[PDB]
Amino acid sequence: CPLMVKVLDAVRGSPAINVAVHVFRKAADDTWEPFASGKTSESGELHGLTTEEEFVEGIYKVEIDTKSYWKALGISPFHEHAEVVFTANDSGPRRYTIAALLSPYSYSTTAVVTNP
Amino acid sequence: CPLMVKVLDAVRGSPAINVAVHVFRKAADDTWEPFASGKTSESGELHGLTTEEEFVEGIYKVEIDTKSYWKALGISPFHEHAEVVFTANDSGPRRYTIAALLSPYSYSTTAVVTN
Amino acid sequence: CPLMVKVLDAVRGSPAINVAVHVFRKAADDTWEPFASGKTSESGELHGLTTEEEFVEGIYKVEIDTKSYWKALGISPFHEHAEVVFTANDSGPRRYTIAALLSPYSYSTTAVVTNP
Amino acid sequence: CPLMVKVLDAVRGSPAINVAVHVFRKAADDTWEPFASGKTSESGELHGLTTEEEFVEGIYKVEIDTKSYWKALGISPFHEHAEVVFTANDSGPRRYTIAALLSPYSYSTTAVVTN
Numbered sequence A, C: 001c002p003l004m005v006k007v008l009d010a011v012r013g014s015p016a017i018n019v020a021v022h023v024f025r026k027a028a029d030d031t032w033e034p035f036a037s038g039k040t041s042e043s044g045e046l047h048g049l050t051t052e053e054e055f056v057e058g059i060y061k062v063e064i065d066t067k068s069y070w071k072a073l074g075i076s077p078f079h080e081h082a083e084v085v086f087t088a089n090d091s092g093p094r095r096y097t098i099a100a101l102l103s104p105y106s107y108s109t110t111a112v113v114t115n116p
Numbered sequence B, D: 001c002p003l004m005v006k007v008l009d010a011v012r013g014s015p016a017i018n019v020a021v022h023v024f025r026k027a028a029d030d031t032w033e034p035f036a037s038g039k040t041s042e043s044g045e046l047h048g049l050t051t052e053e054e055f056v057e058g059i060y061k062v063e064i065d066t067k068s069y070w071k072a073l074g075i076s077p078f079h080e081h082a083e084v085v086f087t088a089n090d091s092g093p094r095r096y097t098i099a100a101l102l103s104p105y106s107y108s109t110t111a112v113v114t115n
């Protein structure tokens, strides 16, 4: 509930389905620790990545594997991935939606942050 | 010099070339009067639309013929066109760039206003 | 159900609430007939604009009143509104989400079109 | 000439000036090695990062220090930075512009790749 990822396809006008997403958290030693991962559903959404207990304060990286998505639709794309890096929960728990809108040579990303 | 339009293609990663662009000025009766038009260049840009003398304060609409652009590339698009409607304000900086980034089902637009 | 509008605020990282939206449909005589209107909710969404019976084939214009939104947050913005113009339902009924992401000097819009 | 970065501000409608930009090249061991860096100019652009000789095929990362930019304007932003990661490909056009459009809680990036 506290972290959701939504991915849209600007070419098709559709959810981006089956997009791999890997989340990392920065460790004490400044490495990126694997935190959670999953795939977008037929709605373009990925729920169930973490829990409010697990999703502590930290610096998180949400890596959206855009290059496999375009390639398996016959578009050799430009980017390797889209990386979204942010501090979370540093004023207490929040709910985060990380959205991405994909094109072969472009993407946009936004965050919607709500206080439960 | 006061108004430039720039159009980019997010599918090909390129300028959007030969895109028709029409600029209108809102009239006193609230209708849109033709003001300037042209086709984007090889660089995706359209310069020479107006002059400082002619580009007075008011409400302008820039209509970008995105549907024809996509059609000519053999791609089916969503929008009829992209319209950008704004007020020219003499208190702000003097040069306006209206940029548009096109995808078949999406577009982005921004204004870069400088002195 | 067949037409939904969602508006997000890129400055706040939040839904854009209380945004006025006016929908028009192009008439036979090429004028823009008022079709429906409403305001975004606290989720940034506007539902209930039309019905599948009413939402016939045509050219529709969704006008999102971005300039009142920025102004009532102390930002004099650049655009008068964001206009989204599209042909709908010309291959039978579809469900349309028109999304807009707003900044004071920029916006993006996308469509998600699904076949029920 | 082969690589330019352009950064724009969607809140002010302006170039994003004095933004730190770091470019890295992916090494054989999968670590990121510093490649080029600079600060955007008054036009929001950063030219002179590399030369045709040095800019060989490979995976590059462009990291744009968006957090410091927003902080210096007294605005609280969401992201730590914006990272753009791509492969340089000799089969495609020769000149790469990496553009970024910044808002506090959002950014857009596109590549304009030309000959």
Ligand SMILES: O=C(c1cc(O)c(O)c([N+](=O)[O-])c1)c1ccccc1F
Residues within 6 Å of the ligand: A006, A008, A097, A099, A100, A101, A108, A109, A110, A112, C006, C008, C097, C098, C099, C100, C101, C108, C109, C110, C112
């Ligand atoms: O359009 C976007 C967006 C975001 C959402 O959270 C969302 O629910 C929907 N939507 O349903 O279409 C759309 C968007 C996503 C990423 C970056 C820029 C964007 F404009």
Ligand SMILES: O=C(c1cc(O)c(O)c([N+](=O)[O-])c1)c1ccccc1F
Residues within 6 Å of the ligand: B006, B008, B097, B099, B100, B101, B108, B109, B110, B112, D006, D008, D097, D098, D099, D100, D101, D108, D109, D110, D111, D112
């Ligand atoms: O990417 C954009 C943009 C703008 C410019 O003015 C420009 O010179 C370049 N560029 O050279 O790539 C790119 C852009 C355009 C419109 C809306 C959102 C955007 F991100």
